[PDB]
Structure 1
Amino acid sequence: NYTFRCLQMSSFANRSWSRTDSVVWLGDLQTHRWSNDSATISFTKPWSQGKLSNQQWEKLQHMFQVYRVSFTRDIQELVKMMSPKEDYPIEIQLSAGCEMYPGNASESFLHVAFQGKYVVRFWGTSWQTVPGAPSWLDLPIKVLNADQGTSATVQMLLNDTCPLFVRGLLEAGKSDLEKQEKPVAWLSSVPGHRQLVCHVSGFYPKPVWVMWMRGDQEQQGTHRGDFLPNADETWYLQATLDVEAGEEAGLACRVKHSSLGGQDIILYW
């Protein structure tokens, strides 16, 4: 079940300074980037064009190129219109894409946050404010909905382009999406109760099991940390256990991960 997420981050500091940067994700892998500094979208994977021909990709990119300039001027206009109630600095974020299922695969979304708060979505055939959003958004959204052409394009992109493109991506990026990288683990602790730490790094895909054991008995105090990214598209996770000094003996950290194939890592303290 993969989610394809196009994330836009736009910052408007004043009338003479703004930037828009985007990143695109397929599951936990980055597939595109588009810096304010670049004229065109960059592939971050060899397969990032999915199954689109050179021509279809160029058309889609031209649309995004026009959109980036238009978006910028639109927000500048929305501020002029709504000011002083809403003035700089302004942060706007857009999260758009689709999630693929079995059979006929998809649900699309386009959510918009203003100053870090979710306020607007595209839904059905038009933009709408979400319940609880500030009333000053009323006129800007009516003004935005008056653009029937944009609405038609957004509906197409979400309903048709996004799932088709993503089907092609999943196909073309199959080997990477299914790559297996092996975790490496190591133990440490800080010195009367000791906190024991089992570090596991370099695994891909994300699902993993890590647990402190004493023989076959699971150590219930095992506390799993957050999944942390490495720069090389693998993961890092640590698992800790509070113990009494002179109790570490006998303890072991066991690691199960799909890339190991039955050869679990078991590291004895």
Structure 2
Amino acid sequence: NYTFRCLQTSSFANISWSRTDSLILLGDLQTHRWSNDSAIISFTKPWSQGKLSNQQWEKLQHMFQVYRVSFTRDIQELVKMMSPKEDYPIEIQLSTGCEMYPGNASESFFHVAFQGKYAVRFRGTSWQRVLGAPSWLDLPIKVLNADQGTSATVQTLLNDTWPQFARGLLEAGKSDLEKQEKPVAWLSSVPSSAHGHLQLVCHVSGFYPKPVWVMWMRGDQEQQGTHRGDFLPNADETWYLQATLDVEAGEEAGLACRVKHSSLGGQDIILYW
């Protein structure tokens, strides 16, 4: 399963000043870039056009261009007219795309965060406020829903454009999405405030794809105290991850870090302290 996503971040500060920046991702790989400074969508992968011919991508691309100017003035008009509070500053985050299921099954979405919080969704033919969002948003939502020309475009996006474009992206970037880069492990330890206690760290960097298995072992036994950190990104879109184990002094001898990854075959990395 891969999530195709257009992620837009929009900031409105004072009556003159706004900027909208966005990127597109397929899974954990970035496929497109659109800074506020550029007039036109960039590719960040060789396959970022997917299967669209030039003519159709240019149509999608011009659609983005009109939207960005239309979106900017709309928000400010909507907020100036109906926001019961001051009409600046406005932070908007926007996520629309579709989740890809194996066998040509998709599920589209269009989510909007207002001042850092989930506020609006688009389902069927209309925008709908979500639970917890400021009730006054009901009025700008109703005004947006009276624009069936925009409603129909969004319907086409969610029903056709995102599923069909992302299926072509997924197959044009299948080789990239399935490349195998190997992890590389190294070890360190840090003291504890208490005596006789320290923390082993198994650093694992450079692996792709993301799923990985890192454990502290004493021979056959997994040390259940192993604490896996968060997946951290590298600049080359490989992944970094560390796992920690608090041990009493002297218990480190004979402990190893075992790394299971799809790039190694069955040959685990086993790195003793």
Q: TM-score range by the shorter chain?
A: over 0.9
* Per-residue CA distance 1:76-123 (angstroms, 9 max, x = gap): 101220245242111011110001113331110000010011111111
Structure 2 segments unaligned to the other structure (5+ residues): none
Superposed displacement of residue 48, structure 1: 0.3
**8 Å Cα contact 2:112/2:120 also seen in 1:** yes
Question: Which whole-Å CA distance do the structure 1 matches of 2:83 and 2:159 have between them?
Answer: 35
Question: Which whole-Å CA distance do the structure 2 matches of 1:102 and 1:268 have between them?
Answer: 40
* Per-residue CA distance 1:2-53 (angstroms, 9 max, x = gap): 1101101000001100000001110111111100000100101000000000
Superposed displacement of residue 144, structure 1: 0.5
**8 Å Cα contact 2:215/2:222 also seen in 1:** yes
Superposed displacement of residue 217, structure 1: 0.9
**8 Å Cα contact 2:95/2:110 also seen in 1:** yes
**8 Å Cα contact 2:83/2:136 also seen in 1:** no
Question: Which whole-Å CA distance do the structure 1 matches of 2:134 and 2:222 have between them?
Answer: 51
Aligned residues: 269
Question: Which whole-Å CA distance do the structure 2 matches of 1:259 and 1:172 have between them?
Answer: 21
Give secondary structure in 2 for the equivalent of 1:66: helix
| Range moving further from structure 2, 21-30 or 98-107 | 98-107
Superposed displacement of residue 203, structure 1: 0.3
RMSD over aligned Cα atoms: 1.0
Question: Which whole-Å CA distance do the structure 1 matches of 2:189 and 2:104 have between them?
Answer: 50
Question: Which whole-Å CA distance do the structure 1 matches of 2:230 and 2:138 have between them?
Answer: 40
Identical positions, percent = 94
Superposed displacement of residue 132, structure 1: 2.9
| Range moving further from structure 2, 104-113 or 12-21 | 104-113
* Per-residue CA distance 1:122-176 (angstroms, 9 max, x = gap): 1111111113322211221111111110000000011011110011011100110
**TM-score of the aligned structures, taking structure 1 as reference length:** 0.98
* Per-residue CA distance 1:213-233 (angstroms, 9 max, x = gap): 111111111111111000101
* Per-residue CA distance 1:175-216 (angstroms, 9 max, x = gap): 100010000000000131110110000000011111111111
1:95 aligns with 2:95: yes
Give secondary structure in 1 for the equivalent of 2:31: strand
Q: Which runs of 4+ in 1 moved over 6 A?
A: none
Structure 1 segments unaligned to the other structure (5+ residues): none
Superposed displacement of residue 58, structure 1: 0.5
